[PDB]
Amino acid sequence: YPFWAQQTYPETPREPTGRIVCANCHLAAKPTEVEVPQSVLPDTVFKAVVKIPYDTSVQQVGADGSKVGLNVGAVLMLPEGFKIAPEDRIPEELKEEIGDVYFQPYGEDKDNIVIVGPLPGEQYQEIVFPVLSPNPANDKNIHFGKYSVHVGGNRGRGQVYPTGEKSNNNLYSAAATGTISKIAKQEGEDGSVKYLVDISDTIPAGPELIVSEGQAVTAGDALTNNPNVGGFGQLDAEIVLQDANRVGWLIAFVALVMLAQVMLVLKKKQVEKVQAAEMNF
Amino acid sequence: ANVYDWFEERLEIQAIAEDVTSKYVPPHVNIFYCLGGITLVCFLIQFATGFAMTFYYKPTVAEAYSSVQYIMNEVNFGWLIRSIHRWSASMMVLMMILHVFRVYLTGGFKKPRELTWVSGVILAVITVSFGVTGYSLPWDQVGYWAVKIVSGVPEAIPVVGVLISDLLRGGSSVGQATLTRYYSAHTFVLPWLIAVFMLFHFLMIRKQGISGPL
Amino acid sequence: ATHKKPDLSDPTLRAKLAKGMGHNYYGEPAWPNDLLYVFPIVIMGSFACIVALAVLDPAMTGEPANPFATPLEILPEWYLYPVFQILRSLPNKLLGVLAMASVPLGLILVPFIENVNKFQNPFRRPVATTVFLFGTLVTLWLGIGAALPLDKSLTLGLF
Amino acid sequence: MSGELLNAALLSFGLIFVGWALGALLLKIQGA
Amino acid sequence: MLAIVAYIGFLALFTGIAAGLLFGLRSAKIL
């Protein structure tokens, strides 16, 4: 979970290479999208949509080995100064769009790094973030300009626990080279379903056994399939913290340029009239 | 008295005016024939803003990135000058490509204008070199790794490859020497080179006139 | 519109026309009609578009260089996408270098190859136009391919 | 990265024809 | 939508400026 990300990697969810830490436990790759404005004004509330799409009709494997629908999660790394908008500043429509999302910072003094999830995947394939842009006018550390936005989006159960132990949502290879003779069942500790396989090793319920009655397998071959139907995907985006004065003066300058062009053309027309009258060109 | 007559008697301005007003533009010259000029415009922009940024940019591994941030955040209209530099660089290359499209699709490279075309190709290589050298001056991840991933390419060349690579990066690895050489290339060598070849280009064009109608 | 017909009674002009020159002796007056009045329109237009782009979409300042951390994405500027693609597609590095060098050299060879005829109009240059369109399409193919995974280079995510 | 790209391409393509049309119109109302 | 109107009328405005300046300076015996 994202709080496992902030548990294992407290400083930041982003490695120096730009790789999001969720990829250390979520080994499958699925497409993640983002929707942010090209530019925003200071002290403005805007929408940032993280899209984590998957096939709802395709279910995953739960911890006990049975089917379950999957949940979605995400980490949104905003530029410095940006943070989740105060509810007093959020319009009613946006409130309607957000839903029951629990926005959390990655840590203190890290309000621009928001983590979200797990959320019911069937109702939250698009997660809406209410973001408040900062204001350079009252913060010397904030400047107008183009900044990066780093998004990580995730579906389904992970493959590795924070303790370092594998989950049942995995493909199970082998242990050695020989002949399969251990296709049974049964248990001991808790409930659920376990499988004992030697040639010793044990594989949990969930992954479908692709090996049946007596197979001559080698070390490295696949004992089961890959039950994973989820995945993690990260993406970069850009946002411009824009100053209204810059744009205003830009518009003025453009207008002046266009006027100047008009005057130049008209002047040429006058000269054409003269050259038509006279005859020295 | 009259100052104009003073400057005329010495500079012979009248001859210049006559020469300028003796030239004409043939009907087949359409809007695409502006592209070359537009390319030049972009370069002039690059020359101006570029010069400006030399008053604040610092070609050191310790200072480069910080100097760029300083230009963007603290320098009056620094963000503007730099952003203009970026966009006008990209536009210079684009307009140059479109210009080549014009020249080729009007057959303007054929006899006797071959040397103008060759001069042109050289100009293209020089311009791309501007791009490559400038791209890495901020010494951010993108630029630095843009250098690292391409600095080892000439090593493929059998006998002189390693030497070429060493000359380009100022050593056997990418570091401060690489930045120094890239900065010299970018603000000294390439401006003068492109000046010389643009001069040849324009002199040859003015000498021969534009190519004929299609 | 101001226009001046070519004086075909002037042997100097005829001599230039025979050599493919002299095409600045006739037509619309360069000065001031084009140079003084139209050129500033182009200059100011170019400058205004560039400035507008600069203001609305300012230059980005990334993160400081890290020699021990290779970014997930590494690309040069767009105009180097084709070459780059070549460079990362060919297993032989030397062959890649030669191919890269072949671009400006081949371009340099173009006039000496197409001097076989004096045609300028592409519609009178079927073979040359075909080769050009082909090369352009290939160049775009490589350029688009550069921004995609290597496994999908000869396909661009199509067939 | 396909939406903004295709949009930019389409615009930079068609605005040319819009400007061409405007210039032509100005020429016609001029009486050239 | 806003971008469309803003684009069209501006454009429409400056074309009005160009034509108005044309016939204006014409009527003012300048052009």
């Binding site: 053309v265 | - | 139209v38 | 400007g19 | 684009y7």
Partner: peptide
């Protein structure tokens, strides 16, 4: 946030208008 839209619009318009004025001044291209 309309000022942003008007900014981009100003870019598009100055592009279009530059083309238009070159076409007008050079009498159609």
């Amino acid at each position: 946030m309309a000022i942003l839209t008007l900014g981009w619009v100003s870019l598009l318009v100055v592009f279009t208008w530059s083309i238009a004025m070159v076409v007008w001044g050079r009498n159609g291209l």
